[PDB]
Amino acid sequence: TLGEKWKNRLNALGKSEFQIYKKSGIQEVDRTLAKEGIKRGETDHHAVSRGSAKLRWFVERNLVTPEGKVVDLGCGRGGWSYYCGGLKNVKEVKGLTKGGPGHEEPIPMSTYGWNLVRLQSGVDVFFTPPEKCDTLLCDIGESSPNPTVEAGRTLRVLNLVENWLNNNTQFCIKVLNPYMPSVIEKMEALQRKYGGALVRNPLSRNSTHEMYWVSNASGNIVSSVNMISRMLINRFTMRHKKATYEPDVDLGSGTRNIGIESETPNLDIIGKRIEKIKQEHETSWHYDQDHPYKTWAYHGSYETKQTGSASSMVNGVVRLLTKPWDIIPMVTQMAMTDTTPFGQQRVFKEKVDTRTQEPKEGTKKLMKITAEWLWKELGKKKTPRMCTREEFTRKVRSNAALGAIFTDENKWKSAREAVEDSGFWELVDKERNLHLEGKCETCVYNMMGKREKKLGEFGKAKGSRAIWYMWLGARFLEFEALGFLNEDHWFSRENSLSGVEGEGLHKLGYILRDVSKKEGGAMYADDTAGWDTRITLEDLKNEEMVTNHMEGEHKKLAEAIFKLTYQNKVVRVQRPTPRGTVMDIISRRDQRGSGQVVTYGLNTFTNMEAQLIRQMEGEGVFKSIQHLTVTEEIAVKNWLVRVGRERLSRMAISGDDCVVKPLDDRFASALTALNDMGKVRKDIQQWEPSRGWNDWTQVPFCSHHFHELIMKDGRVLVVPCRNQDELIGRARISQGAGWSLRETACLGKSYAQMWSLMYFHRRDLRLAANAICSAVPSHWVPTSRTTWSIHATHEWMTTEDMLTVWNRVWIQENPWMEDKTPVESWEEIPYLGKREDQWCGSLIGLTSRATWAKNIQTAINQVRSLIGNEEYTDYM
Amino acid sequence: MAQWEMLQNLDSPFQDQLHQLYSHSLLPVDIRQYLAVWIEDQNWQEAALGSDDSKATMLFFHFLDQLNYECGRCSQDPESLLLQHNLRKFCRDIQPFSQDPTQLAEMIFNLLLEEKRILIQAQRAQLSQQHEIESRILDLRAMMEKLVKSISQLKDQQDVFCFRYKIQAKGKTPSLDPHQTKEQKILQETLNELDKRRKEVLDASKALLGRLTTLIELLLPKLEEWKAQQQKACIRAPIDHGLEQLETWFTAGAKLLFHLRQLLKELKGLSCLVSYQDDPLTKGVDLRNAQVTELLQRLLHRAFVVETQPCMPQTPHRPLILKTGSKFTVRTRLLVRLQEGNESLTVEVSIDRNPPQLQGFRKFNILTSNQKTLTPEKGQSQGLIWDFGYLTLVEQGVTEELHIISFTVKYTYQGLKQELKTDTLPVVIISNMNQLSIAWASVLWFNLLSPNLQNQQGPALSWQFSS
Ligand SMILES: [Zn+2]
Ligand SMILES: [Zn+2]
């Protein structure tokens, strides 16, 4: 056909002549500004790719009218999806792409209606099950000199797309090679079945012969193809016309609401708080109609100033020593996250805004009974009591493990400054008097977002954090109400036979060893994806039952705190807008938000209860969860009395991390009750049986694996271990309390001793800890919160030499060590084998050592002097 | 003695250039003038282009120190509720630079230099090619240093990836471990990083090739003009024709070309190890090498010139004249001062390579040696200098056609050898002294209006009686 002649003619050409044929009447878009707009980091008013104008040309000429739900196949960077998001009738856009080398990946942008668009990467379309949709877009296809392979690709694309269409779905599919018969015959049946036709986009380059199949059109294929081929072969006869430049589209900025709400507030509880907040900022109080909140109620918003940035301080002193670690991508990619309002909104949309489903009757009864029994069991030896102001003053004065709070920067500047003033206590007393009558007025939260890298989410042991700040007075009130749980060690291993609170990091391995001595199956260590957001109202009501052991003012205060604050929340959060930055206020009932220590205790309790119920179910005590009958209620109660205590001794629960050794392997197949309460496991199929371990040295716990070591004389120790890259990469990050040399130097020296105390057994970390301590000028107290906040040890902060501390920790205060003969040098301590060190992430053994060995001798002895005028003292 | 306020008072057109640069530039305009004394007092040049990732950090810390302190003193005075915020606004954008301190020094150092261009231009107007050449070569050297750094970093990253893959291979662990999923994901990330580095290196190399070709095509016309001036000065006219600038430029260009080729050799040798699919290097390396070779050959072909034509030593008044049975002095120079340190360079000569088709012309044979050898140390001591002060010609109307002496050299360096030929100005051979009286006028007849130098087939008062 004429298309074949045109293709042969084009193929018979030179590159210099080719480069001029491309632009001979096509229409171009002037991207002279978009490239450098995107390069500097702008995220609005810009078009990511060229396809936005291509699709716009179709939409304005009403060839295809998107509506309802839109599915994009092979979105690439995502121009078409971003353009479609800002339309009127569009309700949701979903895009799938196949990322990787040689392929485009999606990029994030904040144009109009950016909250309705979701994109995925690394997904292959050809083996993806179909789903319901109302509009279908496909822009896949690659060119090749051979026409036969192009025909095969077109046929494969058509066969893939055929399965998705229905009778009433709008479509726009690109066809690449329509001028040769084997595609023409296939398209005949498709056009007969579904209608439409083919049209050419003027903006397309002159090199390609591609067409598009649209929904609202009519005509004949072969005549159109012949006309286009004739135009193509007649085109290269006139002069070179300058391409008619066209202005690129702009998309504006903002958010867009969908119009559905599924939460109702309780006005009689939060009316006073809302009124006070409104009266404080009355000048710019307005109601926005574009709030993207679905499961949270919306009340209003005002104006504020943006806080936050991308990436944080990197410890200058820590660098210049770990020079060979700059090339490693894990260390650099994890440096620091994004906390700008855009990142906060992204996190809030991704993780916080969810919904859970209520359980059934039998589950409710089982949870009630188990919670009652457990609460009666824990308080056998203890007795609740109230805390005093003196204890709080002492705690705040000594920089104790206080919760994440803000110190009301307006009136005062720091907590220690604000404690001594009397007006603060007057305000606290006023709020206490208000609370005693079942009312609250100044108890609101502040949200802050974090967690936003690509490879940082896999090595920060968290991600999607979304921490909650609280006013100082409310923190004191909560402390006074419920400090006895932590001040009395209610959850220690002695009182409750499962908790490990108060145990240092260097002691958990012995506990894991002792658990392994029992009889049964294998160890199971499943985890939950987003534990904090899966808490339902039933769990809160069950945990509220501790007030039954209280009396008087203590009982009244505890009940008021539980009822007015923990299950009726008001939160402030930021949001970018075309007029600047605004702060919204929202409300919610369920989900967990409180102080850190209280949250830790309650999470431990709930985890223990859920694990007990799962162990119940695996044993076959009860069968059906739809409804629970008599002769099973008594059976459940008898099981708890007979063997309840010894079953609790088979587990070890720190926070929401659990390790269980059941009686038999039936434990892995019982997943009905666990799924019913909402505690869905992470990275597994819903009904897939779990996986166990036959060795205790492989089970992860608190993001650690515990090796065992043999000394020279014969004694055996158990030591913690991690992936060295994570430790090195975290050691480079400064929390932001610097702006000085002394602060950062002290912090570096402070957690350069963690490595000499706990992680001493590996080659590559014991050498990098002597240099840093030989570089600081000594004589400076290393006082700074380093890491492992939950592990209440913080004992490597002393001033004296490390050998004495090592002897005191690993020999004399070790109950599992029998003889107490001490050591007197740093050479008697052995190393972690030879190949196990490389397995866990060292840089020794081969050519990597040929690169690193520049660090030792050659670089260390010279960088310590590179520290500069800042003095020091030798330690190695 | 300072800047800023000097620019403000000068005039609007330079202010607009000042307006454009500082506007889009991250550094805010207001912060520039409040800290003007301190900023100009710091040695930003040393921090941006030096070896010691310590001085840049020191300047980083001191900059933060100054920014924090000045805000507090100004915050004490009210009604300054706009500058105080701007002080904190700048404190957020500096934070991303903490990853690499040297990015600060380069941005500041470049900004200081540009306004110096405006100041000197403004005063000169109020009160060229060589400077452009020097600026071009300076930028070339700087960006070649940048390319060297990028290549070294890519080499190190590829090496550590190869080591990690090797240790994974010797592991031999076919398990369904989430650790395996993690390590395969980070392996994909490393591969993406490697691809990005390779493409960036290719782009930088292409930019270097384009710039260097532009420099060469700008350089050649200067050589042509010098040749024309030499022709106009050899005809009894005093005009200087020094070669120092041209020889320096040619040497710099040759060094840059050789460095670029040598780096690409190493790049391909490195890429051989872990070459895999979707590798544009396999074609980019060869295409860039071919372009570099073509440019080198083109430059070297015109790089051969003759400093001094064969002249009479006893009588310098008449140049470009030959007599039978006498010695002649010729001097040829190579504008490129590059040569291998172990191989001597060999130059041959010939006379009348192409004879005319008319009646048998007066062909002449060189009785003396036609070959000379230069010791390698001569290039360092004085340069590529060829002197034949004793050449003679013998015979095997008198002024109707001229004769051309040709020079031929085989240039070898870094394994590349090219054949080079050049020709001198046409000359006439006289068998006696008396005929020179009209041979001078006949030579003028050829010289005054010859558009083709190789064609063997009032105003004059500045020449006929200037002596
Ligand atoms: Zn209150
Ligand atoms: Zn390990």
Residue numbers in the entry:
A (entry chain B): 8 to 883
B (entry chain A): 1 to 127, 140 to 408, 423 to 483, 497 to 506
Reported in the publication:
Flaviviruses, including Zika virus (ZIKV) and Dengue virus (DENV), rely on their non-structural protein 5 (NS5) for both replication of viral genome and suppression of host IFN signaling. NS5 protein is comprised of two domains: an N-terminal methyltransferase (MTase) domain responsible for RNA capping to protect the viral genome and a C-terminal RNA-dependent RNA polymerase (RdRP) domain for replicating the viral genome. For instance, DENV NS5 interacts with human STAT2 (hSTAT2) to promote protein degradation of hSTAT2 mediated by ubiquitin ligase UBR4. The MTase and RdRP domains of DENV2 NS5 form an extended conformation to interact with the coiled-coil and N-terminal domains of hSTAT2, thereby promoting hSTAT2 degradation in cells.
To provide the molecular basis for the DENV2 NS5−hSTAT2 interaction, we performed single particle cryo-EM analysis for full-length DENV2 NS5 in complex with full-length hSTAT2. Atomic models were built for both types, revealing nearly identical structures for the regions beyond the hSTAT2 ND, except for a slight tilt of the hSTAT2 CCD and DBD. We therefore focused on the class with ordered hSTAT2 ND for structural analysis of the DENV2 NS5−hSTAT2 complex hereinafter. In addition, we were able to trace the hSTAT2 ND in a helical fold, linked via a disordered linker to the structurally independent core fragment formed by the closely packed CCD in a four-helix bundle, DNA-binding domain (DBD) in an α/β fold, and the N-terminal segment of LD domain. The complex of DENV2 NS5−hSTAT2 is assembled into a mushroom shape, with the roof formed by the NS5 MTase and RdRP and the hSTAT2 ND, and the stem formed by hSTAT2 CCD and DBD. Here, the MTase and RdRP domains are arranged in a manner resembling the extended conformation, creating an open interdomain cleft that harbors the protruding end of the first two α-helices of the hSTAT2 CCD via surface complementarity. Detailed inspection of the interaction between DENV2 NS5 and hSTAT2 reveals three discrete binding interfaces: NS5 RdRP−hSTAT2 CCD, NS5 MTase−hSTAT2 CCD, and NS5 RdRP−hSTAT2 ND. At the NS5 RdRP−hSTAT2 ND interface, the α5- and α6-helices of the ND interact with the Fingers of the RdRP via van der Waals contacts and/or hydrogen-bonding interactions, involving residues D53, R92, Q95, P96, S98, Q99 and D100 of the ND and residues Q313, S316, S318, M320, V321, R326, L327 of the Fingers. Furthermore, residues D52, S54, T57, F60, F61, L64 and N68 of the ND interact with residues W746, L748 and L873 of the Thumb via van der Waals contacts.
